[PDB]
């Protein structure tokens, strides 16, 4: 084992999570939007069946979006605000970053 909550480890996991949360949200939004076309086309049953499934899922989308950010932020509050702070050699190239 490397660390327990070490901002290094957390950041290592958080940074990896943010991607999951984002992607997860990206996919969710995709469905929420995509479903739009579905609910926009149906013929009884498949309509309410889907339309409804869209409602339940939609309402759940937010629930998840909440636990996503909340969790994604839970790390921030954990004390993970300094990990990729390796801009030491940033201003370096920066100077040579122009014309």
């Amino acid at each position: 084992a490397e660390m327990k909550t070490d901002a290094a480890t957390l950041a290592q996991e958080a940074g990896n999570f943010e991607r999951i949360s984002g992607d997860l949200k990206t996919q969710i939004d995709q469905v929420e939007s995509t479903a739009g076309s579905l609910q926009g086309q149906w013929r009884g049953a498949a309509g309410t069946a889907a339309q409804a499934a869209v409602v339940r899922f939609q309402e759940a989308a937010n629930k998840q979006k909440q636990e996503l950010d909340e969790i994604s932020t839970n790390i921030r509050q954990a004390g993970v605000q300094y990990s990729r702070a390796d801009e030491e050699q940033q201003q370096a190239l920066s100077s040579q970053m122009g014309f």
Binding site: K4, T5, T9, L10, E13, A14, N16, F17, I20, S21, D23, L24, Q27, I28, Q30, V31, T34, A35, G36, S37, L38, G40, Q41, W42, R43, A45, A46, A49, A50, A53, V54, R56, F57, Q58, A60, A61, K63, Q64, Q66, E67, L68, E70, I71, N74, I75, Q77, A78, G79, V80
Partner: protein
């Protein structure tokens, strides 16, 4: 064109999109779930009630959106699967 409400080439692949989006969340959740225990420490340990409430809260809305996605793709996927096929051939009737 007259109405982007739902393009045929859209609603058609829409379902297919739901499927891919469905699985995406299926794995995604499994992906984040891993960070949950790995981030548990962020909640002040993994054996803390704090992280716990997060775990259940994660799986909570999780399966909620996961199921909704399945049930959604279950009646959506049929779009280009059954819905397209023919009426009465939709999952509603066909197992």
């Amino acid at each position: 064109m007259t109405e982007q409400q739902w393009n045929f080439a859209g609603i058609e692949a829409a379902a297919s999109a739901i499927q891919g989006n469905v699985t995406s969340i299926h794995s995604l959740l499994d992906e984040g779930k891993q960070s949950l225990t790995k981030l548990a420490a962020a909640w002040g340990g993994s054996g803390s009630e704090a992280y716990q409430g997060v775990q259940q809260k994660w799986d909570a809305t999780a399966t909620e959106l996961n199921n909704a996605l399945q049930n959604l793709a279950r009646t959506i996927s049929e779009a280009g699967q059954a819905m397209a096929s023919t009426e009465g051939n939709v999952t509603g009737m066909f197992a």
